[PDB]
Design a protein around this ligand. Structure first.
Ligand code: HEM
Ligand SMILES: Nc1cccc(CCCNCc2cccc(OCc3ccc4ccc(N)nc4c3)c2)n1
Ligand SMILES: [Cl-]
Length: 362
């Protein structure tokens, strides 16, 4: 039980990790040191090299991610030494600052202590480290509907949002042995935000839309050789459609297409006018324009798919199977204008990888 699965994943991982690092000779002894450690202790501890390359492999294996060309330049921050809430908080603050990098975003992951055996050492409640709160009372909706349950969790613990449409949620996480999480307001100085303007349509600013600079996904588990890093927030830069075609456009999110139609001067009355499609394009142009104007990293979906084609080519050249989720790789805007749409992808799950895990709240 347990201890044998771990040993199994350890061999598979160390073998492949050391091959890729050109250290195949050291596999026998390292598996023989892991040998004993799992016997005596029930677990084993990755070297800094194994953990860094493991997190990079996990990104490379993420079937749904179009951005995987850059998997090998991931900036991995080893924070397995953290023991206190102040240290977790400061490491999360640090992640924001160094990932943001004044707008020239650095793909970064901060890795906290892995679970003991099932027991989390640190449990992060945020979905992303920077995200907007969401409210619904009396049928007035404010903010980001996808954040309603966490926002309400946060307000149970004594936080109170100003109830703008763009309240920054606090960092919220629980330590092993604490019954409740703590929360910390984000220092505003750390959070870049981009007002959404349009290159051509001066009135687009009347919408008073903004989005934050850096998506830092903080609720996924990193699995590396049987070790379960449930707390390992990571970030890339945005692909513009995530903001323009989903966050700001979806009916169950900010639902802005009808307001976009009005400010760009087209009627939103007939499906055959394709006003939603037109508003989608103009909003997505505005998002790319705005991030570029402010000097915040962003990629459009055409360039992203172009990079992903190079990832595919690199995989074949390296003899690695390519895996991918066609339904998530195609962009939600003009998908058939990318090569992705016109091919198929094996959706097999390879480890190391990032995985969903149950929310600690409800
Ligand atoms: C460098 C810029 C990056 C871009 C532009 C990018 C782009 C994306 C996009 C567009 C998605 C689809 C999500 C959606 O449509 O809502 C995605 C999924 C994903 N990306 Fe990336 N990504 C990047 C970096 C990273 C990094 C650094 C990691 C981890 C180290 C990562 C891991 C993933 C994972 C795990 C998913 C799937 C999440 C899920 O199932 O919900 N990505 N990526
Ligand atoms: N029914 C379907 C079918 C097909 C595709 C979809 C797309 C889901 C998008 N629905 C918004 C959303 C929900 C949950 C998680 C999300 O984020 C994942 C993620 C992870 C890492 C990223 C790294 C960089 C970056 N730029 N983005 C990332 C996004 C998004 N739904
Ligand atoms: Cl997002």
């Amino acid at each position: 039980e347990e201890k044998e699965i771990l040993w199994n994943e350890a061999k598979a991982f160390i073998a492949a990790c050391y091959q890729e690092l050109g250290k195949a000779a050291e596999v026998k002894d390292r598996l023989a040191d892991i040998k004993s450690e799992i016997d005596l202790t029930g677990s084993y501890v990755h070297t800094k090299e194994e953990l860094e390359h493991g997190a990079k492999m996990a990104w490379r294996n993420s079937n749904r991610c179009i951005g995987r060309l850059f998997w090998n330049s991931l900036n991995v921050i080893d924070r397995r030494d953290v023991r206190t809430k102040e240290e977790v908080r400061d490491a999360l603050f640090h992640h924001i600052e160094t990932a943001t990098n004044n707008g020239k975003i650095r793909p970064t992951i901060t890795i906290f202590p892995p679970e003991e055996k099932g027991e989390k050492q640190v449990e992060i409640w945020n979905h992303q480290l920077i995200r907007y709160a969401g409210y619904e009372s009396d049928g007035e909706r404010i903010g980001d509907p996808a954040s309603c349950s966490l926002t309400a969790a946060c307000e149970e613990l004594g936080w109170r949002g100003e109830r703008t449409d763009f309240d920054l949620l606090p960092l919220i996480f629980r330590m092993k042995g604490d019954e409740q999480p703590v929360w910390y307001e984000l220092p505003r100085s750390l959070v870049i935000e981009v007002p959404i303007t349009h290159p051509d349509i001066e009135a687009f600013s009347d919408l008073e839309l903004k989005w934050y600079g850096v998506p830092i996904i903080s609720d996924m588990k990193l699995e590396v050789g049987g070790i379960h890093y449930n707390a390992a927030p990571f970030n890339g830069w945005y692909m513009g459609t995530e903001i323009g075609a989903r966050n700001l456009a979806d009916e169950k999110r900010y639902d802005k297409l009808k307001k976009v139609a009005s400010v760009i001067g087209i009627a939103a009355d007939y499906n055959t006018d394709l006003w939603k499609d037109q508003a989608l394009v103009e909003l997505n142009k505005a998002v790319l324009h705005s991030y570029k104007k402010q000097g915040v990293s962003i990629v459009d979906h055409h360039t992203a798919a172009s990079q992903f084609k190079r990832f595919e080519e690199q995989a074949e050249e390296a003899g690695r199977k390519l895996t991918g989720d066609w339904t998530w790789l195609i962009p939600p805007i003009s998908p058939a204008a990318t090569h992705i749409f016109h091919r198929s992808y094996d959706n097999s799950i390879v480890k190391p990888n990032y995985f969903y895990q149950d929310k600690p709240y409800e």
